[PDB]
């Protein structure tokens, strides 16, 4: 998705809003099914691209829809994918070193007791390799 | 920085941790010169330090990561987005009271600029390489 965002970004910065819009729009579609997102600065960047291009073009209605979607994402209690893998690595590394686990534990058992990550959470290594460097 | 990170990732997947650590660590101090590349480098360091049985460096790395993630600053996109929402709602004769109240509170507390940054500003300033 990043080569497309790259091009959409340059096009938008030059002022080719209509050319840019389609690129942001397909990148949005990619993310929304094939990942839901993953980590939410890229969705937000995409929606910012859409909102700007729609305003310039000017579908203020479509721009307002983009803003709504963004504010929902921003308002939702969505942890960031790396928070669970780090809590787990921190609980584990505290054991290896004979140190306290219970604030990192209690936090991982609240993300679990409220549904925000799996019991066994994803691991640092899992997310490391699955991350695309595009 | 990306060449160094993808090269580090592939050695980590290959199981060559000492080699990959050297790259992750160098990629870290080049970023010294949006928490995702940092978080990922720290995950690279924490995974390699751990495999090489340097658990303390790994825990240190994971400590920074938990710091970066505990950040209490508003998401940078929040204010630009409220501004856009208020402006567009007014233009279109729709309700802006809630979003405007939220923006005004951020402005009053000094958590954003008093005409906030625009969506275009953040679009420009963001780096994808």
Swiss-Prot record, chain A:
Subcellular location: Cytoplasmic vesicle membrane; Early endosome membrane
Subunit structure: Monomer.
UniProt record similarity statement: Belongs to the sorting nexin family.
Function text: Binds to membranes enriched in phosphatidylinositol 3-phosphate (PtdIns(P3)) and phosphatidylinositol 4,5-bisphosphate. May be involved in several stages of intracellular trafficking.
Comment field on protein domains: The PX domain mediates specific binding to membranes enriched in phosphatidylinositol 3-phosphate (PtdIns(P3)).
Annotated protein name in UniProt: Sorting nexin-21
């Amino acid at each position: 998705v990043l080569p497309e965002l790259r091009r959409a970004q340059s096009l938008t910065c030059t002022g080719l809003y209509r050319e840019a819009l389609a690129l942001w729009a397909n990148a949005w579609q990619l993310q929304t099914q094939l990942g839901t997102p993953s980590g939410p600065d890229r969705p937000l960047l995409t929606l910012a691209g859409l909102a700007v291009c729609h305003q310039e073009l000017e579908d203020p209605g479509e721009a307002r829809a983009c803003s709504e979607k963004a504010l929902q994402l921003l308002g939702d209690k969505r942890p960031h994918p790396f928070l669970a893998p780090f809590l787990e690595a921190h609980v584990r590394l505290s054991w290896r070193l004979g140190l306290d686990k219970r604030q990192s534990e209690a936090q991982l058992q609240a993300l679990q007791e409220a549904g925000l990550t799996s019991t066994p959470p994803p691991s640092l290594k899992e997310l490391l390799i699955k991350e695309v460097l595009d």
